[PDB]
Amino acid sequence: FQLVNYTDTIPARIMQQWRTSDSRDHTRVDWKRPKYTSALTYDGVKVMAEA
Amino acid sequence: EVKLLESGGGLVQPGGSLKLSCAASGFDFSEYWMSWVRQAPGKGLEWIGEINPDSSSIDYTPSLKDKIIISRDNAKKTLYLQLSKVRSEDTALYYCARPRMDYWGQGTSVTVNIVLTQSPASLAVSLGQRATISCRASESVDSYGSSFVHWYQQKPGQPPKLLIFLASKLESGVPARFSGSGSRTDFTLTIDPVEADDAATYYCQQTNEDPYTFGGGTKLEIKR
């Protein structure tokens, strides 16, 4: 099963946003092997921000 | 502004120890990560390692782990590199750099698949002109719409300053004399106007996936 296959326009826009935030200065521990838990984390913090 | 100064370099005997310091000024070293990268004389660069601000995870290359130690001091804002049992391959120019706000320090000299091809190898351009340097990648370097490729210029005795970042943005401090463009297999850096101080070796490096490769080096000649 797949909840996020990372190709749709708004998820790829979010992908491009955090790739740019990587490429600006620095972030924490690396990438290229993602996790759906991190996507749920991002969406839950977005839920809290909208709330 | 951001300033990094390396010290402790020079000459060292084979088999001994060596400690190089790198002081920072103008920024906060207690939040920004640091990195160290080596460069052989006449060859490409080689990333030695990276270290975080809290000194909790210091990463390095898998082939140079038994002879390199990276530490930092946030109170003094100074990084430290310790080498033990130096060999003939240790005669190189090391360079401490910020988290690549990408800025690289001067470094110190110690004397004891993605393929990026530059085009051309050497060219001579007059003053006040516009030069073009192309770069071809063997694999796709495009990820999430942004091309994560940096263009730097290193001179003889000078370190490679990060000129162009992400193939579409100019770095702070450098004037509006270098632009970048391209698409997904071919990158192109343009210089307009051409000054006499820009006579150095240009290098395009992409760090999209493993391994982080570097460019072949394209020297720029100023006509007279």
**HEC profile for B125-176?**
ECCCCCEEEEEEECCCCEECCEECEEEEEECCCCCCEEEEECCCEECCCCCC
Pick among B144, B146, B150, B151 to test the A interface (most A CBs inside 10 A): B144
Q: Dmax over Cα atoms in chain A, in whole Å?
A: 35
**Which of B57, B144, B210 lies nearest to residue A16, judging by beta carbons?**
B144
The span from the CA of B44 to the CA of B104, in Å, is 16
- Identify the CA nearest to B101 among candidates B153, B34, B155, B55: B34
Helix then strand count (H, E) for chain A reads: 2, 0
What residues of chain B lie within 8 A of the CB of A15, using their CB?
A: 143-145
B33 residue type, one letter: W
Cα distance between residue B71 and residue B63, in whole Å: 19
Are B149 and B138 in contact by the 8 Å Cβ rule? The answer is no
A16 and B209 within 8 Å at the Cβ level: the answer is: no
Closest CA relative to residue B96, chosen from B157, B35, B161, B26: B35
- Give the separation between CA B133 and CA B54, rounded to whole angstroms: 40
A25 touches chain B (CB under 8 A): yes
Distance from CA of A50 to the nearest CA of B (A): 25
Chain breaks in chain B (C to N over 2.5 A) after: 100, 112
Q: At B161, list the tokens.
A: 């300053």
- Way the structure was solved: cryo-EM
DSSP characters over chain A: --S--S-SHHHHHHHHHHHHHHHHS--SS--SS--HHHHHHHHHHHHHHH-
Start-to-end C-alpha separation, chain A: 29
Helix (H) or strand (E) holding A50: helix A36-50
Mind telling me how many Å the CA of B146 is from chain A's nearest CA? 7
Amino acid at the residue A51:
A
d(CA B17, CA B36): 18
Q: Residue B65 contacts by C-beta under 8 Å, 6 or more apart in sequence?
A: none
Matching residue, tokens 């297999």: B185
Q: Which residue of B has its CA nearest to A6?
A: B144
Q: Which of A17, A18, A24 sits opposite B101 (nearest CB)?
A: A24
Q: Which residue has the tokens 């839920």?
A: A47
Q: Which of B25, B144, B49 is nearest to A6 (CA)?
A: B144
The answer to whether B100 and B150 have CB atoms below 8 angstroms apart is yes
What is the Cα–Cα distance from B133 to B202, expressed in whole angstroms? 8
B201-206: strand order across its sheet:
B122-125, B218-222, B201-206, B149-154, B161-165, B169-170
SS3 state at B196: coil
| Residues facing residue B203 across a β-bridge | B152
SS3 at position B195: coil
Quick check: B4 and B98 in contact, CB under 8 A? yes
Please give the resolution of this entry in Å, rounded to 1 decimal. Answer: 6.5
- With contact defined as beta carbons under 8 Å apart, do B192 and B198 qualify? no
Burial A7-39 (b: 16+ CB within 10 A, else e): eeeeeeebbeeebeebbeebeeeeeeeeeeeee
Q: Cα distance from A31 to chain B (closest Cα, Å)?
A: 9
CB B208 within 8 A of CB A22: no
